[PDB]
Design a protein around this ligand. Structure first.
Ligand SMILES: Nc1nc2c(ncn2[C@@H]2O[C@H](COP(=O)(O)OP(=O)(O)OP(=O)(O)O)[C@@H](O)[C@H]2O)c(=O)[nH]1
Ligand SMILES: Nc1nc2c(ncn2[C@@H]2O[C@H](COP(=O)(O)OP(=O)(O)O)[C@@H](O)[C@H]2O)c(=O)[nH]1
Ligand SMILES: COc1cc(CCc2nc3ccc(C)cc3s2)cc(OC)c1OC
Ligand SMILES: [Mg+2]
Ligand SMILES: [Mg+2]
Lengths: 431, 437, 155
């Protein structure tokens, strides 16, 4: 398990994915041309995971950029590292999906999907021991939502013995352009519960509330939100990109974090929370990091962990610190919150530490939780889906593209079931 | 000669293996490249240590060891460490993809892709023996490879080498130093499928080795290296009788005769003393009676349990150093009297004693202080059923909700094997129950 | 038949068609299978101009389809602020209840149309109105954890 193949779909998928490469490249010593201009040597021990070593010291992200709207092409290339991507890995169509999941999953998106699989194959055939894929997309659009899940399902057929990852962004009326986002999301959650092993829920309602209330940004822009996304995507991928004693891979994470196949939606959290500019968050102690990680205010999913039970947890501390002061503080939080960890999964909290701190900070802690409280995010998406579907509003857009009204109700029932399972294990006891 | 082939499976087995073979070389005067100056033999001979070391024509002594792992990251350090040119290169086998803490991957999907290569390599070592007597398998209960592949290996070895013996050195999982929530599953799964094929298994409780390092060696947060060096000290004590001319436990079959009355309850409890920190180089030298009594203080055991709450079925005392037998008999009579240690009414109530007059060796770089006399008590007591009770409890909290079971079923394994392994473990707890009172 | 041509013209936004189809006597209060009048459809697709036209030519601002949905329900749901005021200016029943027990305040809350929530509130939107599950608009802001919406619903 060495190489990972990264894919990004739609405006949101390419925007947060482009930021993900600007971040890990900075940490690994890569420049927008590929030349490794780093100083340390731990930046290369596991560079094969995301980069391909061609030319001389020319590294190239093992990334695949997809979007039905061609306007995203020049956008990504206009960015800082926009020139590092392989130019043949750009697979962009002409007509956008117009927030129409059906267009992205059944019509326009199906015309372009096979062009993307050919790119995936070339990237996958150049791997010594591929360990899986990871996708970045939004659930409220048409390309990332519809063509994403279609592309996911098509890859499951072709690489069934590999791990499927997603960084799925959830819609929110606080950061929203259309009321059909619940339609697109619910139809996508129906696919993510059956065709992915791990999903990092990055809720836009949470990203907004952090900026608007915690960071006190009067009017949060996407850039402010994505500053939180990239920081979370850098921590959750720390152990994949630096060896340590755990030598972690996507499969070891799924085996230990996903007790049940359908319940694979992780609730990521970060600490310290900072906006683009602030420098006052450069002295957080270990006890503050620990408490501030399980704090609901630090979750990237608009959910309260205290309203549920943790199935599993995976804390990641970053920076030069005391591996002991961590191990004792992590055991503390597991007592004052003892009732928030299911008693039928012994030792369900793992702690790792990496000495390389992220850019801008000297110490950081990233949280990955499989909390039954994540049903709150789904009941919210569902309540909105229902409100629209009960009035059968804007259905003709989807049915006109071939979809069947029976398919909406199937996706609704599946999410209601998904919330039921969470409630089961939230109330279950050992006895 | 009566050769022994040591097999190491998984990260744990490999790393414990590398520490034991580091120690062996020093106890026998073998350099990291195999060259021993004080051995007239140049092609083999029949010394006591040839059981563990082959010998080329150039006078190089190559361990009779095989190292296996489904990833290369760990065995790649053996191939580049202080003992590069010590082991047989072909006897350092690795794969590309590990078992992801999954028993079913190490035993079915992934393990099948490498099993035949490991057997052919073992067969190569076996064919270079004139009287192979069995294997010493080192592996953890928790990993996917240590549990899955090892179990798969013990099955094939019983079919190919049916007359030979098989001894285990198992690493009982501990939560202070763990790596996966599904280790209870892997532990129960391998024990069930291996209990049939193993003749004698020495469990090592990482929590016990962990406690010893924090209180007897003064190490705040012990590492896998601290544990391994300490583990290699106990292992060496058990394998010493096979590597030096001795009277007690001279071959693998005798381990069964002296320690394993009944096949199923073949899990003896090891206890080792003294363990003194290297920062105390000028410590008072403890006597035979003080270390013989130390073997009954539960704080020195390799598995956490209460032997006072269990009957003894066998007890071997392996002394090493400046030990006079008269002081050993006296110290045994002191234990047989003042101590209320109960033996089962059907076994002999005596103690077997072996003495190896070589001073214990400490690895140059470790945390253990040189001592003039140490002892290792192997004892088969029913109190070790408590260790099976703790594992069985975890494999119960989770399986009751069928947690993580889908990861095993999706790797070519039937759900029924969980209920089989647990019922077999339940059956083991009653075996210890009936032997005691 | 001009009834259908006005229904499909209002949905699409064909303003000029409305001025013509109505010229030939098209039933401004026509209905489709579900009971949607041209004003329902106009209010659902943000066609403010057609909304004002239909209201100045006999449209029933409080008409209801088979599911009890008034034009304001749809305006509150889809979130057309201007149309929510025009409808209210012409006597829209701000507390109209549909077959699911929802009021225009309920749907504006679920969808996060905070501007329309404030507008409906100042026009008499009942905050104790419950749906078939007993949930009020405030209950919804607490269950979903919408801090912004919960603050607006208590002024
Ligand atoms: N005493 C000791 N225990 C170890 C050591 N290394 C790993 N372990 C234990 O082994 C268990 C996990 O099994 P591993 O051996 O690490 O995994 P593996 O055998 O390589 O199998 P995979 O997971 O497929 O790689 C954990 O409970 C660890 O505590 C070691 O060096 N010394
Ligand atoms: N955080 C973040 N969210 C975005 C961004 N762009 C779009 N979104 C969200 O994604 C949803 C729209 O999906 P979108 O990606 O634009 O559709 P698509 O491009 O056709 O696949 C909305 O709910 C937006 O809030 C972005 O750059 N950052
Ligand atoms: C991909 O990122 C990670 C993967 C792992 C994989 C290894 C795991 N071992 C256990 C054991 C027990 C439990 C309860 C959960 C886990 S997760 C660990 C991480 O941080 C500790 C990661 O974050 C960067
Ligand atoms: Mg391993
Ligand atoms: Mg391994």
């Amino acid at each position: 398990m060495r190489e990972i193949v990264h894919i990004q779909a739609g405006q949101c998928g390419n925007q947060i994915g482009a930021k993900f490469w600007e971040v890990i490249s900075d940490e690994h010593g890569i420049d927008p041309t590929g030349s490794y201009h780093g100083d340390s040597d731990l930046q290369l021990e596991r560079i094969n995971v995301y980069y391909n070593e061609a030319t001389g010291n020319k590294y190239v992200p093992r990334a695949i950029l997809v979007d039905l709207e061609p306007g995203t092409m020049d956008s990504v290339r206009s960015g800082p590292f926009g020139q590092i991507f392989r130019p043949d890995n750009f697979v962009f169509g002409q007509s956008g999906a117009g927030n129409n999941w059906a267009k992205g999953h059944y019509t326009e998106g199906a015309e372009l999907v096979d062009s993307v699989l050919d790119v995936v194959r070339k990237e996958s055939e150049s791997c010594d021991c591929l360990q899986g894929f990871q996708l970045t997309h939004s659930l409220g659009g048409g390309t990332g939502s519809g063509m994403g899940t279609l592309l996911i399902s098509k890859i499951r057929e072709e690489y069934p013995d590999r791990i499927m990852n997603t960084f799925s962004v959830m819609p929110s009326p606080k950061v929203s352009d259309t009321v059909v986002e619940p339609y697109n999301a619910t139809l996508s959650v129906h696919q993510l519960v059956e065709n992915t092993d791990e999903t990092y829920c990055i809720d836009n309602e949470a990203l907004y509330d952090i900026c608007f209330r915690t960071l006190k940004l009067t009017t949060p822009t996407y850039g402010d939100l994505n500053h939180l996304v990239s920081a979370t995507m850098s921590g959750v991928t720390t152990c994949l990109r630096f060896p340590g004693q755990l030598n972690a891979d996507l499969r070891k994470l799924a085996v230990n974090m996903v007790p049940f196949p359908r319940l694979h939606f992780f609730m990521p959290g970060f600490a310290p929370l900072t906006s683009r500019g602030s420098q006052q968050y450069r002295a957080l102690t270990v006890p503050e990091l620990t408490q501030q990680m399980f704090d609901s205010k630090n979750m990237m999913a608009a959910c309260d962990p205290r309203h549920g039970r943790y199935l599993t947890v995976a804390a990641i501390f970053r920076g030069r610190m005391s591996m002991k002061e961590v191990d004792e503080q992590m055991l503390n939080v597991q007592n004052k919150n003892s009732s928030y960890f299911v008693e039928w999964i012994p030792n369900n909290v793992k702690t790792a530490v990496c000495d390389i701190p992220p850019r801008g900070l000297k110490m950081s802690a990233t949280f990955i939780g499989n909390s039954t409280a994540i049903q709150e995010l789904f009941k919210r998406i569902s309540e909105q889906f229902t409100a629209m579907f009960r009035r059968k509003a804007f259905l003709h857009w989807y049915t006109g593209e071939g979809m069947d009204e029976m398919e909406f109700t199937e996706a609704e029932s599946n999410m209601n079931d998904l919330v039921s399972e969470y409630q089961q294990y939230q109330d279950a006891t050992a006895d | 000669m009566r050769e022994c082939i040591s097999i190491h499976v998984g990260q744990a087995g490999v790393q414990i293996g590398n520490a034991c073979w580091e120690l062996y070389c020093l106890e026998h005067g073998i350099q990291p490249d195999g060259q021993m100056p004080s051995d007239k033999t140049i092609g083999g001979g029949d010394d006591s240590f040839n059981t563990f070391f082959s010998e080329t024509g150039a006078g190089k002594h190559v361990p009779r060891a095989v190292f296996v792992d489904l990833e290369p990251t760990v065995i790649d350090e053996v191939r580049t460490g202080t003992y590069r040119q010590l082991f047989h290169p072909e006897q350092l086998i690795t794969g590309k993809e590990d078992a992801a803490n999954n028993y079913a991957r190490g035993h079915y999907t992934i393990g099948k892709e490498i099993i035949d290569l490991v057997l052919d390599r073992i067969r190569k070592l076996a064919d270079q023996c004139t009287g192979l007597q069995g294997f010493l398998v080192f592996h953890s209960f928790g990993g996917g490879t240590g549990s899955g592949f090892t179990s798969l290996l013990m099955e094939r070895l019983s079919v190919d080498y049916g007359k030979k013996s098989k001894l285990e050195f198992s690493i009982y999982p501990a939560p202070q130093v763990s790596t996966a929530v599904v280790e209870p599953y892997n532990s129960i799964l391998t024990t069930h499928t291996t209990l049939e094929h193993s003749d004698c298994a020495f469990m090592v409780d990482n929590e016990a080795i962990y406690d010893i390092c924090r209180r007897n060696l003064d190490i705040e947060r012990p590492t896998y290296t601290n544990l391994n060096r300490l583990i290699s000290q106990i292992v060496s004590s058990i394998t010493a009788s096979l590597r030096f001319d001795g009277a007690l436990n001279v071959d693998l079959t005798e381990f069964q005769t002296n320690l394993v009355p009944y096949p199923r309850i073949h899990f003896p409890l090891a206890t080792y003393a003294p363990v003194i920190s290297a920062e105390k180089a000028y410590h008072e030298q403890l006597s035979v009676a003080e270390i013989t009594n130390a073997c009954f203080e539960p704080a020195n055991q390799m598995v956490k349990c209460d032997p006072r709450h269990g009957k003894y079925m066998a007890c071997c005392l392996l002394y090493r150093g400046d030990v006079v037998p008269k002081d050993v008999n006296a110290a045994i009579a002191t234990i047989k009297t003042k101590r209320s240690i109960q033996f089962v009414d059907w076994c002999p109530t005596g103690f077997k004693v072996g003495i190896n007059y070589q001073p214990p060796t400490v690895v140059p770089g470790g945390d253990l202080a040189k001592v003039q006399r140490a002892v290792c008590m192997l004892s088969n007591t029913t109190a070790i059923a408590e260790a099976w009770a703790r594992l069985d409890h975890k494999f119960d909290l989770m399986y009751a909700k069928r947690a993580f079971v889908h990861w095993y079923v999706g790797e070519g394994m039937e759900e029924g094997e969980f209920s089989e392994a647990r019922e077999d473990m339940a059956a083991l707890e009653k075996d210890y129950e009936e032997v005691g009172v | 038949d001009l009834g259908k041509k006005l229904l499909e013209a209002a949905r699409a936004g064909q303003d000029d068609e409305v001025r013509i189809l109505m010229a030939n006597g098209a039933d401004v209060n026509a209905t489709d299978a579900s009971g949607l009048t041209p004003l329902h459809l106009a209010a659902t697709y943000g066609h403010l101009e057609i909304v004002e036209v239909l209201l100045k030519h006999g449209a029933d601002v409080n008409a209801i389809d088979i599911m009890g949905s008034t034009p304001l329900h749809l305006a509150a749901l889809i979130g057309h602020l201007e149309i929510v005021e025009v409808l209210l200016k012409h006597g829209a029943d701000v507390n109209a209840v549909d077959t699911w027990g929802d009021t225009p305040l309920h749907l504006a809350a679920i969808m996060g149309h905070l501007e329309i929530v404030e507008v409906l509130l100042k026009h008499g939107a009942d905050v104790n109105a419950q749906d078939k599950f007993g949930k009020t608009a405030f209950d919804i802001s607490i269950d979903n954890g919408n801090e912004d919406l919960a603050e607006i619903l208590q002024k």
